[PDB]
Amino acid sequence: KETAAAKFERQHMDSSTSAASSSNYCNQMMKSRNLTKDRCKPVNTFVHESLADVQAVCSQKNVACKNGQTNCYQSYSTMSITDCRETGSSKYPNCAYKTTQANKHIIVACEGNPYVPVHFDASV
Ligand SMILES: Cc1cn([C@@H]2C[C@@H](O)[C@H](CN3CCCC3)O2)c(=O)[nH]c1=O
């Protein structure tokens, strides 16, 4: 069974590229990480930093989560990320995405022992 920590890694980690992420990136990545299986997931962010660096965000700047919970943390440094957002003409099962690379602070929710990222909240 997939732990919440594992699901965060599958959905949100891509340390293998620094972000040279082509226009193709989101179409390929959303599919291979199984985010287009039951529907087209509308919005999803991939972080291009080490797992150690992203996990360390759980000990960084504590900020309110969008849902009002208090277990969110914003990175002190900007990180290389790619936002994937569904196009208007995207129709399941042919999920289509706009790929946008940026350098931004990430906000993640953390839980558990060890205290690790389990949700991607936002980038700022
Ligand atoms: C704003 C933003 C949201 N997401 C997320 C991942 C997943 O937690 C979220 C789905 N939310 C669930 C309720 C509202 C939307 O899209 C991202 O992956 N990147 C973002 O920049």
The number of residues in the chain equals 124
Contact indicator for 96, 87 with CB cutoff of 8 Å: yes
CA 119 / ligand 1 centre spacing (Å): 8
Alpha-carbon gap, residue 71 to 4, rounded angstroms = 15
- Does residue 119's CB lie within 6 angstroms of at least one atom of ligand 1? yes
The count of structural domains within the chain is 1
**Domain containing 22 — which CATH number?**
3.10.130.10
* Element of type H or E holding 120: strand 116-123
> Solved how?
X-ray
Q: Which one of 12, 33, 48, 105 is the catalytic residue?
A: 12
Domain residues for the domain of 49 are 1-124
Q: Locate all alpha helices (DSSP H) within 13-115, ordered by sequence.
A: 25-32, 51-55
Q: Identify the bridge partners of residue 111 per DSSP, sorted by sequence position.
A: 116
Alpha-carbon gap, residue 55 to 57, rounded angstroms = 5
Q: 21 φ, ψ to 5°?
A: -30, 110
Residue type, 70: T
Residues 6 or more apart whose Cβ sits within 8 Å of residue 111: 4, 71, 118
- The reply to whether 105 belongs to the active site is no
Contact indicator for 35, 86 with CB cutoff of 8 Å: no
